[PDB]
Amino acid sequence: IDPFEMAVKQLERAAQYMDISEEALEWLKKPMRIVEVSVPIEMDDGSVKVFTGFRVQHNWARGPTKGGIRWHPAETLSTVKALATWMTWKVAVVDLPYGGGKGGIIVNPKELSEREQERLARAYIRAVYDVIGPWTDIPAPDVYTNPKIMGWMMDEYETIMRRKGPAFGVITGKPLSIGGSLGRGTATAQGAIFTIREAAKALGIDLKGKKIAVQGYGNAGYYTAKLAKEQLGMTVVAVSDSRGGIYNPDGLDPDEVLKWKREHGSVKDFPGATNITNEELLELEVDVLAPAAIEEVITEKNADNIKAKIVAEVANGPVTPEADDILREKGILQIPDFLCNAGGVTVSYFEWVQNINGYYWTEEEVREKLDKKMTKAFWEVYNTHKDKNIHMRDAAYVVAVSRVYQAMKDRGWVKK
Ligand SMILES: NC(=O)C1=CN([C@@H]2O[C@H](COP(=O)(O)OP(=O)(O)OC[C@H]3O[C@@H](n4cnc5c(N)ncnc54)[C@H](OP(=O)(O)O)[C@@H]3O)[C@@H](O)[C@H]2O)C=CC1
Ligand SMILES: O=C(O)CCC(=O)C(=O)O
């Protein structure tokens, strides 16, 4: 299934719930600029290898485009286009002055040296310099890409630009020593926690002493469980990893679980906790369920058996549309995927603002601003949810597309 057509059909379904002109829909169905470049690097053996690089700028009506760079051997142009289109709505739903962008290189970085990786980053910057900038396109870390590559890319951009502007702001996710921002590591989990708290407030239930189950125990899952336990005061009763999962009705300590995961390679066989399966964790009777793992964990097969009141989609699309219908009929409030995990891009926006201004904030200021942004975005989505009597995902899509459409109309791009 083409990832581009899928995004287009998603956009058409969103447009079905709102009044949008056909010309605007056709404009939004096509990326405004796609750049495909050859990335030649010198290998350690002395030969010269050429890679394929992409940089798709879907739409920049609201401002400079934003999006990460992927280094995956299976990366395709359609994937970049779909992810840029997705990023447009992600930055629109949280009200950032940003557009949609995405980049990628068809490369297997598992078999590249550090010097070869640096050469790849610098050559990619040299290839795509003409379409990126602090006010044109801001790349970001993504799968198989880390802040080290961001530092290399920023250095190359600064070298090419001859320091004629804010070279720090050309890219986000940089190391703290060079234009980095505080709060980047726990951005996604913090945004998810804020959305969960706002959802609980909307449903009129307090989270003090409640039960939360988290699927996937990576950076997002671990920090979600932790931040829940401290800030929200909830009782983490179950966590899981690809290998397996564990359950304990008396609660779990996220630090100890992470220590055991980092020692034995998995969260399995934790003391005082019985080993369970991922599906058993999904169907556990809790108050908040936060899948932070591979996608399509909630489908038509198991959607009816879910007992959680709040499902926070920390990961990317862990629920299939039939499962959305089943859960909405069940009365379970869902937080849309690109609204729950919008903390990372918000924190990225904050880093760009700090770089542009030349003044850097503390952890408390970043946390407070992220709280405001997430609270406002969630309440807007929930108000659309109740007013239009549609699904939460549908409301988030309506809000994002409405913002982009208004920006497009104000510029005069579309006359209707
Ligand atoms: N990476 C980011 O910055 C952000 C990520 N997201 C989305 O969130 C999710 C998680 O992000 P991230 O923290 O980077 O993930 P990680 O790569 O850091 O870790 C993956 C975690 O999920 C587990 N996992 C992988 N497959 C399964 C599975 N089939 N069943 C159960 N657990 C599984 C892994 O287990 P194990 O420890 O055994 O490997 C691990 O615990 C992704 O879907 C991602 O797209 C969006 C927000 C930003
Ligand atoms: O953080 C960014 O600017 C983009 C990264 C991304 O693609 C995401 O957060 O989903």
From Swiss-Prot:
Binding site for NAD(+): 216-222
InterPro entries with a match to the protein in the record: Aminoacid_DH-like_N_sf, GLPV_dehydrogenases, Glu/Leu/Phe/Val/Trp_DH, Glu/Leu/Phe/Val/Trp_DH_C, Glu/Leu/Phe/Val/Trp_DH_dimer, Glu/Leu/Phe/Val_DH_AS, Glu_DH, NAD(P)-bd_dom_sf
Name of the protein described by the UniProt record: Glutamate dehydrogenase
Single annotated GO MF: glutamate dehydrogenase (NAD+) activity
NCBIfam families named among the record's database cross-references: GdhA_Arch
Alphabetical UniProt keywords: NAD, NADP, Oxidoreductase
Lineage, opening ranks: Archaea, Methanobacteriati, Methanobacteriota, Thermococci, Thermococcales
Family indicated by similarity: Belongs to the Glu/Leu/Phe/Val dehydrogenases family.
Organism: Thermococcus profundus
Complex and partners: Homohexamer.
